[PDB]
């Protein structure tokens, strides 16, 4: 009952859908407790 806690994923070109490796990014953000140093693009238009 002594075990090492960590092992490889056996990722091979023959693995099935879902058994394959998938890349993951998770966008968290924390908000409004201080000024919003990020926003997306606001659009612009011709100056008539």
């Amino acid at each position: 009952n002594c075990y090492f806690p960590l092992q490889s994923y056996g990722f091979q070109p023959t693995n099935g859908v879902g058994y394959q490796p998938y890349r993951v990014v998770v966008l968290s953000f924390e908000l409004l407790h201080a000024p919003a140093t990020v926003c997306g693009p606001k659009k612009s238009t011709n100056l008539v």
Binding site: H33, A34, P35, A36, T37
Partner: protein
Amino acid sequence: NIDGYFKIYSKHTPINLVRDLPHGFSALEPLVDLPIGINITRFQTLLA
């Protein structure tokens, strides 16, 4: 440091007159507005 934005205002004035600190009128333009969001209490300065 106000509303979570920090603001540097400044003027450069090449007074060649030797005496200390002039009386006469001029005003600081705003240089920089920064979203730094930090509380503050004191400051220090850097000399060569």
